[PDB]
Ligand binder design. Structure first.
Ligand SMILES: [Mg+2]
Ligand SMILES: [Mg+2]
Ligand code: NA
Ligand code: NA
Lengths: 224, 223
């Protein structure tokens, strides 16, 4: 039995460091779990102005916000109210790498709100690279490949940041999702993602995010 | 001009998380910079008993402790008293990965002591793997390859943990060393490392480490 409802709130707190630069970001938002859409408004409360591209942080601020078709098992919505956590490695093509974790739970009170405890760390970003030089434009849309491994769920996705001077900067995501209770495990499937920073101030001390995600079984064998 | 001396003290503080498990470790030690040897006594003050193999943490608690021959430029000893910092990725063959940083400086009280601020984070270690199951025995010795890149120093090394059931568990280290002031840059070279946990209690809440390291230019061309 799922306790998820059409309109739920979001609360997040991220603490971390990139190339040794510490920072803390908090935020609030809301999402529609069944429609696979969400909004998050963030504020850098420590470490601002950030010396690195804010884009590397955006995907770390909840797969519960994915429109899952009836035919595919939804690992995430089943996990609440207890929730789940995730671990992720993000390996960039120039050697830069980031690791992040998120522990997600629902508030005891019937406020229908998700709480996110996030840790984010990145190292080895070249001084002349697009991340430290803040030359990124946006993340392209993507399709995450979901598969079960040793009783938990894994998600791998080829990501790419469009750069100011044109061209792309690739990053490989490897995520492990762990429900806090026994839930039904899904067969191999996919999750399409589309996101964007809908608003931000000069130094990205204030940032608004939007994400739309939908699960599917891939291209059908027959054309048309 | 180098301000390094034959006997120097070490103070370390590591805070981090592995697979979401938070922990804090502090310690004190001493080393002989010119001989390339050091000892560090560690104590887990938060998060114990650690659910993961302590071995993954050991190399994160200072390349200043390396015997450098006169012929090779010493990037590390030159950097003090200001010091330097390093960033490192440790990629294991089963997907587990750790990132660590260390900001190193000398106290300005003339006590010949290095202070180390360390952050350590690891994720994606399989529940049935040797790290979460604590099936590691020790790190094998190694040879780090040092090379300059964009004005700073990089160090890459093929590491391996011997496992209890026999066999090895490989990890690739990628480190970037950044001096806090302008220092002479070295040509491509190598640093041999030999380390060992000389003592530890049952759950590794108390651990003693020893490391020996020496820089060199590789095998001579002539036999
Ligand atoms: Mg922008
Ligand atoms: Mg042992
Ligand atoms: Na399914
Ligand atoms: Na040299």
């Amino acid at each position: 039995v799922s306790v998820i409802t059409s309109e739920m709130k979001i609360e997040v707190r991220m603490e971390g460091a990139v190339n040794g630069h510490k920072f803390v970001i908090t935020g609030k938002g809301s999402g529609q779990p069944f429609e696979g859409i969400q909004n998050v408004d963030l504020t850098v409360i420590e470490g601002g102005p950030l010396p690195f591209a804010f884009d590397i942080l955006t995907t770390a601020f909840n797969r519960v916000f994915v429109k899952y078709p009836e035919e595919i098992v939804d690992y995430f919505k089943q996990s609440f109210p207890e929730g789940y956590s995730w671990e992720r490695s993000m390996s960039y093509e120039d050697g830069g790498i980031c690791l992040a974790t998120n522990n997600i739970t629902m508030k005891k009170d019937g406020s229908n709100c998700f709480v996110n405890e996030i840790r984010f760390d990145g190292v080895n970003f070249p001084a002349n690279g697009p991340v430290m030089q803040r030359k990124t434009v946006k993340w392209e849309s993507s399709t995450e490949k979901m598969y079960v491994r040793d009783g938990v769920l894994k998600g791998d996705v080829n990501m790419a940041l469009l750069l100011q001077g044109g061209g792309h900067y690739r990053c490989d995501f490897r995520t492990t999702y762990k429900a806090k209770k026994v839930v039904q495990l899904p067969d191999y499937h996919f999750v399409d993602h589309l996101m964007e920073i809908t608003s931000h101030d000069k130094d990205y001390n204030k940032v608004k995010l939007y994400e739309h995600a939908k699960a599917h079984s891939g291209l059908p064998r027959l054309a048309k």
